[PDB]
Structures are given as structure tokens and as C-alpha cells.
From Swiss-Prot, chain B:
It comes from Homo sapiens (Human). Glycans are attached at N130. The chain holds residues 1394 to 1730 of 4563 of the full protein. The lineage of its organism: Eukaryota, Metazoa, Chordata, Craniata, Vertebrata. It comes from the Eukaryota. This is Apolipoprotein B-48.
Length: 192, 337
């Protein structure tokens, strides 16, 4: 039933499917998929920035034209002040640290400029500063490949040293699973 | 402020909290309740150094003196320093409380000495509680030398009338827990030593118990172990006394080959003997059973047997029983295939 005259086409098609599947899972790796997702997110972010930049101008022109005929310019000015200016949260002094001042508005989001928190975790060897993040270009920003935990002491009794949690190990494990699955074909079961 | 004593009072409390950017911390929690029935004096110190030499210090001074007889006091001393690089931590906690005639005091002492260079830790703890009608005394010690833990537990229950000692061993990823509990109340010569040990596939299970009350020398044994292929377990229970004796043996074999069990029970009551034996095997070749039980009373006896063989090829069920009861020749032959 699996090796008749009409089954050679099925066998060849399944072999081709296994090869194409292997080609695809050669690509859905850890770092490959991370880079592809970040690049796609950056591209769609830039396209959305352009579209919103056009649409804000168009809507402002429409609102100005409508207000110059119905004497409702006060509401238009209120909306422009509330949207264009937004609100600027100043530097925040907390136990985690000093948060730099940031303005939430429409232009700050158009420019894609994020101030990461500048916090200092006590009893740690690694510090995380306020790193500028650009959302338009994410394929090259904050790429998790090499990560290691800092050494820390809790309750003055539990001292955990540095452990390197690195994505190359998981990528190797995934590739091994890919090879193991590809090497396994589906055939007629054995009598055992 | 008023002409009435009960109306005049004082309630106050300081909520000090200071952080210097030198990674310096300071906490003050003050409390003073000035009243006609209770004179509370609460104050707690806690200062921490988040920079170099992370010394941990904390002092609690609790002074709530009531003006009606109850006098409460307690002090907490938190000592945690970094001796050059060796970490020395000392905990001194005492709670002292009496009202008019009742006494209540439980003292505690903790000492920890850990070597981060070698992973060695030395943990020493002391417990003593004294009351008007209660005595508490416990000690705990442990030796964690980088994976090798040597835990020893012991306590003195009501001046040690009930003795409980425990021993925990975990080395090279092999857990081993040993403990004992004994009782010295009245004739209750109770003594149980529970024991349990672990491995990667097997974990031995043994336990014993002796009641030993007056003339009752009761014993029960539980013996079993676990594998990836089957579960053997054997419960052995012996209740013996001056005249009668309760003897039961439980045998349980479980494996891929078949199900085999043997619950053997015998009783001896002076002029009465009764023994209770079964053979129940359940394998792939069919169910085979055997029942063995005979009634021995004085002279009159009731000998009985029962066999069975449940197999697809053929069923073997035979029965036979005979007795001389009251001089009567009772007998049956019940065999059929």
C-alpha cells in the first residue's frame, strides 16, 4: 500500500516537502528570526511614521479650514495644544535611580527616540544605563545573543556567581532538533 | 491638656527615613504612648550601608509597661558584619513576658559562619523556652561545605519526656533523611525510627514502630522500595501479648512479570489456632489463586483449602473441606473443570 505504482509520486513529494521544511527551519533560528523580526518592525515603524506625519498635517489643515467657517477655533487650538505638546514628565528620583525627563507627544514618537531607565540594582556587578533606543532601526539595537547574570548576594547568605545565559546554546539545540526530526522519516510500522 | 487625667494623654511617633547618595541608609521608628494604663516605649534602629562593607544592623527596644500589673519587654539585636571577607552574622532575640504570676520566656541564639572562598558554611542555632508550666529546649546545627550538608536536629519536649532527634544527609546529589521519635509518658515505651533515602531511580522506604505498653509488645514493619519497573512493598505487623498473639505478614510483589501478593496472618488464642494465608498471582498466563486457612480449636479442627486457575485454555476451580466437629464426619468434594 505504500510502494504501489501510485505511491512513487507521494514519496517524491514527501521528500521534497522534507527538504523544503529543512530549508525553512534552517532560517527560523534564534538570531536569524530575531534579526528578521526586528528589521520588519523597524520597516513598518518607519512607514507608519511617514504615514502619521502626512495624516497629522492633513487633519490639521482640514480642522483649520473647518474652524475658519464655523467659529470653533478655540476647540481646535485646545486640541492642538493638547496633542502637539503632550506632557513632559521630569527626572524622577526613586529607589531604582534617576529617570531622565521625557516628553510624551506626537513628534517625540515620530522621531522614535526612547530613553531607557537609568537604574542601579544594588549588590550587582552589571549596571544598566539610560540607552537611547531608535524604533525605526531595531535590527541593530539591543540584540540578545550574549547575556550573563551579574553576581549577587541575598540575605548575606546566598551568593550567586555570574552565569552566561547565551542564545548560541539554544540555537545549537534547536539545530540539533531540526537535524533529528529531518533524519526521521515516516514509513510503514515494524511488526515489533 | 485638660483637668481630667483620663482625657489627658500623649500619642507620638517618629517616621524618620534617610538615604544619603553615598549608598547610606538610616531608619528610625520611634513610639511613645503616654497613658494612664500602659506606658509604651517603642523604638527600632535599622541602618544599612549599601556601599563598601555591607554591615547589617538592627536594634529593637520594646518597653510597654502597663500600670495594672502586666509588664512586657523585648529587645531584638541584629548583628551582621563582614569580617575582612569572612561574613559573621549574630542574631540575639529575647522575649520576656509576665503578668502577675505566670512566667513566659523564650531565648534564642543564632550564629552563622560561611566561607565563600570554599563554599563552607557553619550554621549554629539555639532555642530555649521557659514557662510556668512549659519547658522548651532545642538546638539545630548544620555544616554546608559547598554541597555537602550535615544537618542535625534535636529537641527536648516538656523537659525531654518526648525525645525527637533528626539527621539530614545530602551529599553528591543523594538525599538521606534519618530521624527518631521516642515517648516516655506512663507505660508508653514508644520508639519509632523513620528512615528514608533517595537516589536517581530508587528511594528505599523502611519504617518500624514499637508500642510496648504493659504486656503488649506490638510491632509493625513497613518495607518497600521503588524502581522504574515495579513496586515491591512488605508490611509486617506483629502484635504479641501475654496469652494471645496477633501475627500478620503482608507481601506485595508488583512487576511486569505479574501481580503476586501474600497476606499471611496467624492468630494464637490459647486453645484456638487460626492461620490466614492466600496465594494470589496475576500474570499474563492467567489468574492463579490459592486460599489456605484451618480452624484449630482445642481438638476440633476445620481444615480448609481453596485453589483456582483462571486461564483461557482451561479453568481449574476445585473445593474440598472436612472436619471432625462434635464427632460429626463433615466432608465435601467440590471439584469441577
Amino acid at each position: 500500500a505504500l510502494s504501489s505504482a501510485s505511491l512513487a509520486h507521494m514519496k517524491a513529494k514527501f521528500r521534497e516537502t522534507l527538504e523544503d521544511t529543512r530549508d525553512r527551519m534552517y532560517q527560523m533560528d534564534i538570531q536569524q528570526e530575531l534579526q528578521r523580526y526586528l528589521s520588519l518592525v523597524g520597516q513598518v515603524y518607519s512607514t507608519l511614521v511617514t504615514y502619521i506625519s502626512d495624516w497629522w498635517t492633513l487633519a490639521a489643515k482640514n480642522l483649520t479650514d473647518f474652524a475658519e467657517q464655523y467659529s470653533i477655533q478655540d476647540w481646535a487650538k485646545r486640541m492642538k495644544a493638547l496633542v502637539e505638546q503632550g506632557f513632559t514628565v521630569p527626572e524622577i528620583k526613586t529607589i531604582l535611580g534617576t529617570m531622565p525627563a521625557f516628553e510624551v507627544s506626537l513628534q517625540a514618537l515620530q522621531k522614535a527616540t526612547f530613553q531607557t531607565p537609568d537604574f542601579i540594582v544594588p549588590l550587582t556587578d552589571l549596571r544598566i544605563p539610560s540607552v537611547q533606543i531608535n524604533f525605526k532601526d531595531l535590527k541593530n539595537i539591543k540584540i540578545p545573543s550574549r547575556f550573563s547574570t551579574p553576581e549577587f548576594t541575598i540575605l548575606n547568605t546566598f551568593h550567586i556567581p555570574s552565569f552566561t545565559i547565551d542564545f548560541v546554546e539554544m540555537k545549537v539545540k534547536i539545530i540539533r532538533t531540526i537535524d533529528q526530526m529531518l533524519n526521521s522519516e515516516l514509513q510503514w510500522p515494524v511488526p515489533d | 491638656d485638660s483637668v481630667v487625667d483620663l482625657l489627658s494623654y500623649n500619642v507620638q511617633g517618629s517616621g524618620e527615613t534617610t538615604y544619603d547618595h553615598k549608598n547610606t541608609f538610616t531608619l528610625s521608628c520611634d513610639g511613645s504612648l503616654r497613658h494612664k494604663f500602659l506606658d509604651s516605649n517603642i523604638k527600632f534602629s535599622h541602618v544599612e550601608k549599601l556601599g563598601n562593607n555591607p554591615v547589617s544592623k538592627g536594634l529593637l527596644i520594646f518597653d510597654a509597661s502597663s500600670s495594672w500589673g502586666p509588664q512586657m519587654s523585648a529587645s531584638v539585636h541584629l548583628d551582621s558584619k563582614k569580617k575582612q571577607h569572612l561574613f559573621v552574622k549574630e542574631v540575639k532575640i529575647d522575649g520576656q513576658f509576665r503578668v502577675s504570676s505566670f512566667y513566659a520566656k523564650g531565648t534564642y541564639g543564632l550564629s552563622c559562619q560561611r566561607d565563600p572562598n570554599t563554599g563552607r558554611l557553619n550554621g549554629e542555632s539555639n532555642l530555649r523556652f521557659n514557662s510556668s508550666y512549659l519547658q522548651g529546649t532545642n538546638q539545630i546545627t548544620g555544616r554546608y561545605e559547598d554541597g555537602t550538608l550535615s544537618l542535625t536536629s534535636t529537641s527536648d519536649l516538656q523537659s525531654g519526656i518526648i525525645k525527637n532527634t533528626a539527621s539530614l544527609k545530602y551529599e553528591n546529589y543523594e538525599l538521606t533523611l534519618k530521624s527518631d521519635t521516642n515517648g516516655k509518658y506512663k507505660n508508653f515505651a514508644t520508639s519509632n525510627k523513620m528512615d528514608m533515602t533517595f537516589s536517581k531511580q530508587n528511594a528505599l522506604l523502611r519504617s518500624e514502630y514499637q508500642a510496648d505498653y504493659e504486656s503488649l509488645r506490638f510491632f509493625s514493619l513497613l518495607s518497600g522500595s521503588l524502581n522504574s519497573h515495579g513496586l515491591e512493598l512488605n508490611a509486617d505487623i506483629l502484635g504479641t501479648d501475654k496469652i494471645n498473639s496477633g501475627a500478620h505478614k503482608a507481601t506485595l510483589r508488583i512487576g511486569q512479570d505479574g501481580i503476586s501478593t501474600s497476606a499471611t496472618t496467624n492468630l494464637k488464642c490459647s486453645l484456638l489456632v487460626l492461620e490466614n494465608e492466600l496465594n494470589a498471582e496475576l500474570g499474563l498466563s492467567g489468574a492463579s489463586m490459592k486460599l489456605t486457612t484451618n480452624g484449630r480449636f482445642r481438638e476440633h479442627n476445620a481444615k480448609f483449602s481453596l485453589d483456582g486457575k483462571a486461564a483461557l485454555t482451561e479453568l481449574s476451580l476445585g473445593s474440598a473441606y472436612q472436619a471432625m466437629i462434635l464427632g460429626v464426619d463433615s466432608k465435601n468434594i467440590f471439584n469441577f473443570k
